[PDB]
Design a protein around this ligand. Sequence first.
Ligand SMILES: CCCS(=O)(=O)Nc1cc(N)c(F)cc1F
Ligand SMILES: CCCS(=O)(=O)Nc1cc(N)c(F)cc1F
Lengths: 300, 237
Amino acid sequence: MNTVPFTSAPIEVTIGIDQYSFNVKENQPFHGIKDIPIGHVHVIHFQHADNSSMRYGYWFDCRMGNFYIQYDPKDGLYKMMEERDGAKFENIVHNFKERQMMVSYPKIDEDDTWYNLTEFVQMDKIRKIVRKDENQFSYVDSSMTTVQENELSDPAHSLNYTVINFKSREAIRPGHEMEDFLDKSYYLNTVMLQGIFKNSSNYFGELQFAFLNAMFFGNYGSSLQWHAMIELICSSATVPKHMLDKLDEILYYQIKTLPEQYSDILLNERVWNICLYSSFQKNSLHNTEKIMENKYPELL
Amino acid sequence: GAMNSSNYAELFNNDIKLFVDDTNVYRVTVHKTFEGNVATKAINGCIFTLNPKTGHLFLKIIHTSVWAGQKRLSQLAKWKTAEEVSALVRSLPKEEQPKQIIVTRKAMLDPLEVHMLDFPNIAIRPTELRLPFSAAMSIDKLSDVVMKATEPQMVLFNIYDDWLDRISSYTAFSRLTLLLRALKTNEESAKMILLSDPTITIKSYHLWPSFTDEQWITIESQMRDLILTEYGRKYNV
Ligand SMILES: CCCS(=O)(=O)Nc1cc(N)c(F)cc1F
Ligand SMILES: CCCS(=O)(=O)Nc1cc(N)c(F)cc1F
């Protein structure tokens, strides 16, 4: 179990760690988060009390380094930093754990939620969507635009998700216009899976990362990407059976975890109705359809 | 975006544009089978592709063989339309190419956009106008060439005959749409008005009779009356 030490908490802020969150009062004696499960990526995120605009945060993997948070009063935010001196870090947490100034990652043993939401998400793929090669962790916030959004302004601050566009030469083979537009299997299987992602695990990883950025930061471009990756599978008549079964599990846990009161903005009526009721795979997402119907019957 | 009454003079400016109407692509009669079930029989159809500035009609005849062994024909017909319009654009030289294609039915947008991916600078637009181009098959010479076709064929016509020698494109389009609206609302009466007078003939190379300017005024008035007379029956007003 690993730890992320905070220098302090000088401004009042709501701190999240994965699907949990804590309110920290201005100059309350908060020095970090302990007992973080090893084996998964994690995200530590922030929303300041005095300006709820800009949710922001950091994707990290404790196996890749020792990371701590310190507030910067010039740039006005909590920054993640990497400590190269193992022993210094090791003894700091020790002082802070001994004075009981850390909250504990509150993981119920029975609970597989975070694993289920990050099953295919890997730090190495995050760092290629979020390009800042001098850090081992990746900053994301509410306002960052995606490459696709930019095409339709600062590139170094972009979310480099894979561009998906159903009315593009990439999606449509010359001579198979109607076929490819009505059945997206060649775009899914040959262009995207075999060509760009190489396998279904990397495709699901980006889909899961997009959902998590949409949920945790209200990142609208990430929400677009999540729905696009869902629609591309559901709009394909030929999908490997293991992918349909895995997709049903992935979406079930995403819909399970979504705050009920965020459904309006985060869920796109057109995509979900098409996917559950109209598409080729309308009968392949039994768990997702059941949780959607019992939890958000209005949307449909 | 969409073409309507606000931006209507745009049709007669010098940017090449083409209306595309797919109403008459897939044409069927519905009938009873021996077992008392219902079946369709297709007849030849046509794509109506019209430059409104010049009167140029690219009439692509859609032969019933297109449909052989195909399913979901009403869906296929939109894609076939889009395929043929794309092929037409590719066939024309650069300076004869449309800068916009206006589809009369919004369901044509996606099929045509997908077939025109190689032409990103040709705008594909819908229209809010109700245009009467379905009535093209009430024009005798157009109906005849479609029905007699034995294979896919493109036939070219000028739908304004020689009118542009004497009137503007705006006025020619107004006359065309009035005639077609009349033929659509009451074909029998409209044709009676056009052919009532033995002394007025249709040139071999024309679609409409050779009326003087003054006779066109009378004819146009009679077509307006026909349209109102018919309307007071539909709605009982
Ligand atoms: C000199 C350290 C100030 S502190 O309060 O210990 N913050 C902190 C500082 C460093 N360098 C770190 F590795 C971990 C920490 F949590
Ligand atoms: C070439 C003249 C043949 S026509 O049917 O009289 N008019 C005509 C028709 C079309 N479609 C055109 F592109 C150019 C034309 F002049």
